[PDB]
Design a binder for this molecule. Structure first.
Ligand SMILES: Nc1ncnc2c1ncn2[C@@H]1O[C@H](COP(=O)(O)OP(=O)(O)NP(=O)(O)O)[C@@H](O)[C@H]1O
Ligand SMILES: Nc1ncnc2c1ncn2[C@@H]1O[C@H](COP(=O)(O)OP(=O)(O)NP(=O)(O)O)[C@@H](O)[C@H]1O
Ligand SMILES: Nc1ncnc2c1ncn2[C@@H]1O[C@H](COP(=O)(O)OP(=O)(O)NP(=O)(O)O)[C@@H](O)[C@H]1O
Ligand SMILES: Nc1ncnc2c1ncn2[C@@H]1O[C@H](COP(=O)(O)OP(=O)(O)NP(=O)(O)O)[C@@H](O)[C@H]1O
Lengths: 281, 268, 281, 268
């Protein structure tokens, strides 16, 4: 049986339930917060479970649960190695550099002094990001030294250990949008332009979205980024820069609720077929 | 040649510096907080470096630097995968379970009510640990429900989301000491009881320690064992071992063995 | 006009709106998160406002807003002095000691070593509380030295500055319940028994409630506690101990949604009449 | 007689100790972290104490001790009400507004979107402060919306609920210095520019400083002023003044004046 692991039901999960039924896939939902995860002891909720789709909103919960399923010998999409690689921006950027994929100039400082040096060397504006976090949390477009000094002080004084690694990236001049590509295994299945006047292009900051036709370069880059972080089912974010397409981020738990209408592609169905027909083995 | 990555020089790093010199091993010390880590730009400090020993006191700095060196095609001891796995007690316990290695009964909950239900099923006393090292601060032996309830709320309310993962373990009755085993590759080279005394290697200690090291991906690690009534149990695997005193205690050339290992790792 | 200041509408606030209409009181609701609080400049939402009832769930928001209203010369129930005194358990206990009101033995430590000494001197079980917090947050019944050491370590390692003051109180053996008294000015208007098997007697931990008839001692103590913290409209919590009634806590923003049915007393109406007829002047 | 409440002895506290001795003033030093503060049990350390000077470096410890001494009927300099009011910049600004004292244009928001709307209406640059002292860490001069957006999110996401109160203030153009005035009761006794130099008292400095001290409830406080194009503006009022260097800079017996004040406060 397919288990859909979750903590909060979003419309994306509701769509997954609907397609599983329409497809005649034997499935059940598993509420991860109530799941006892004792090593050596399969909990009641997972008896009969033959493959799992990890759909938790909390990535630390999602990752702990993915790890647990691997301990029980149940295949999980995505694998913990993929979730871990996607959940740490430095691990992602390192993986992309190794794969030889194009990305914005990217650097890591482990103290305030190095972080300032780098931002000055990159030149303003420059982007500062937390290494761990999601949904565009705590990103900063830093436009001068005093904004830089103040952000770093807030990270040091208020942030935990994680916020003491400073992820510094060239600010990329985008043409009012970015690209998100939905990758299922070795295929790019669909893509969107996310258009906004705000440098953070999400729906919530006054942004809109349209179909992004797959081009040979968009598909090649996206699938390559997906392979770089360990494969599976992922959303790849790209920027159109002056020097060509750059890979920005890879997301382990992709949202698609509006994008199935935008693209006309059966994204939840592709996800479910991948889990049932390839991950399950 | 070798680079030793460090942030604060401890006596352990000086012994490595002094053993390398004594061995006539070409090496440089690389101060990570000042190392420029720009992807696609090899820094001057890493020119001609063929292997690195990750010796940072900060594990998150150490991991970040290890990843960087892998992007440069420089083998690092330990590999980022090993550091990652050792640094998360749930990742370690899962790897141990998958390798079939003995360990205390262990569970994770992601929610206070389930964590409380689990603690209740384990029975008191039960141990609660943070999943991400402290280095050892927040561990509690919890002896009843009221203590359990309060600690779980404190973790949740006060702690980062990191403290929202509740690592629950059976309390193991044992002889008021632990065994720490120094593993270098496929060999246990030395062990201590922790006034720490030498712990002569046995077949059981050697087999289980190397097994635990392999389970987390292999390398240079310290493995902690419990002497339980049901046998030796793996507690934790540490990615950056301290050995300053244990060189005297065990009479084993721990730093020499580490550097010899790093030299073979240099091959690719 | 009466302004009801709020951040999240609970059933208590809904009842307040209903009684204000039934009473023909000119009133409006003011959503504090959207309220611009510029000193020297009355915002649009407060034009015509003649008295305010502070009903925010967040006590730091509620207090900031109460302070603001005083800067505009608008009477507010409760006054900031009352909110501040009720919101800090040490300030409350100090005020009760000065008033000569009976309370559990209570002490404050400002470091781990003093906190341990006190708990050992009080003897287990002993209660440890944060000085600031509400709705029974972070309370601990501490039953031995190792539970004590572990709680103090979590406070020190994970808590901010506030959690570095340790409020230590004798554990009071209660008869399976505590008393809450609703005080409006110089009158105790109603009271409840809060019954539970859990030492924290709230609804959420499996507790129930019944009418607590007002006795001369219950009324005298409750009104006296109310005066001790600066007066106004407050809920006073008492314990029946072996040495008589003790005052535990005074609450600046009382909840009463179930208690109007339990007691048969028009609690929101009394609150509204106090604000309109006495605080407004 | 006098008790001086302290936690860490700074040069300021030694000068107080040494002035009291020189004055022949009977006093004791009371180490607050070891002071038993049990309500209803006067501790031995406070026997015969008729007034206290609150000199703790930690303001939350200092406030807690001040409250305790008031329960004992011992007058404290400063009173808990004054410490409380000085320690919260929104409480201070509100007290200043109510007293009709000049200050920079100041606003509070409790929500990021409203805070951003306010910053936008003030116009850039604008100052963002934490409401609860740092002692001075987190203050930002914010020069545009992007910087504003990021700082507000960092405060909200990373900070305690204390950082969910957004204290917004007009940026004041001023001559690259501030004035700090030492107020003892109804008198300004000395002032500095802050290589801090003496700032001779004037009528304007004296009037506004004593007014600010009275606005927060009166006592022994340092008042910070801005020399703006529209006059002197009150910035902050500090409940535990430091004066070690300023005794030399101003040539005023600051500690003597503080102790004289404490002696009159002893009367009730
Ligand atoms: N270096 C950069 N230059 C320009 N724009 C950037 C840069 N980094 C991020 N952005 C924008 O900021 C947003 C968030 O990116 P990021 O947080 O790195 O990944 P993400 O969380 O997957 N994206 P989102 O869906 O917005 O949360 C995207 O809309 C990007 O276009
Ligand atoms: N499940 C358990 N049962 C009994 N004792 C335990 C258990 N887990 C840990 N301990 C004990 O807890 C103490 C501290 O354990 P731990 O925190 O894992 O090591 P540590 O103190 O971090 N040592 P180090 O790594 O050198 O800092 C040791 O004495 C262990 O014996
Ligand atoms: N010293 C004590 N001895 C026994 N029980 C106590 C003690 N302190 C608190 N309690 C119980 O714990 C609960 C919370 O008290 P406290 O947090 O101090 O005030 P409160 O938040 O107004 N009450 P609540 O409505 O439960 O949130 C009450 O039900 C009390 O009966
Ligand atoms: N609204 C404002 N406009 C211009 N400058 C300001 C404003 N508020 C504060 N400052 C300046 O900010 C700097 C630090 O201010 P502040 O943090 O209030 O004092 P501080 O650094 O804490 N001094 P201390 O109390 O001795 O630690 C000073 O140089 C002030 O001049």
């Amino acid at each position: 049986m397919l288990a859909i692991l979750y903590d909060r039901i979003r419309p994306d999960e509701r769509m997954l339930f609907e397609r599983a039924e329409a497809l005649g896939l034997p499935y059940k939902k598993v509420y991860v917060p109530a799941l006892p995860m004792v090593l050596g002891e399969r909990p009641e909720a997972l008896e009969g479970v033959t493959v799992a789709l990890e759909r938790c909103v909390s990535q630390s919960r999602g990752l702990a649960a993915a790890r647990y399923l691997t301990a029980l010998g149940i295949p999980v999409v995505n694998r913990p190695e993929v979730i871990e690689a996607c959940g740490d921006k430095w691990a992602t950027s390192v993986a992309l550099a190794k794969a030889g994929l194009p990305q914005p100039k990217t650097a890591l400082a482990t103290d305030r002094e190095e972080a300032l040096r780098l931002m000055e060397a990159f030149g303003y504006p420059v982007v500062l990001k937390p290494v761990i976090g999601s949904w565009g949390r705590l990103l900063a477009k830093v436009t001068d030294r005093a904004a830089a000094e103040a952000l770093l002080e807030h990270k040091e004084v208020l942030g935990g250990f994680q916020h003491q690694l400073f992820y510094i990236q060239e600010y990329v001049e985008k043409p009012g949008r970015d690209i998100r590509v939905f990758v299922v295994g070795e295929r790019a299945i669909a893509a969107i332009y996310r258009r906004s006047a705000h440098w953070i292009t999400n729906t919530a900051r006054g942004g809109q979205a349209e179909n992004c036709p797959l081009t040979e370069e968009i598909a090649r880059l996206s699938v390559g980024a997906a392979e770089a972080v360990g494969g599976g089912v992922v959303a790849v974010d790209l920027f159109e820069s002056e020097r060509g397409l750059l890979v920005n981020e890879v997301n382990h738990t992709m949202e698609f609720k509006n994008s199935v209408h935008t693209t006309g592609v059966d994204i939840p169905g592709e996800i479910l077929r991948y889990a049932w027909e390839v991950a399950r083995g």
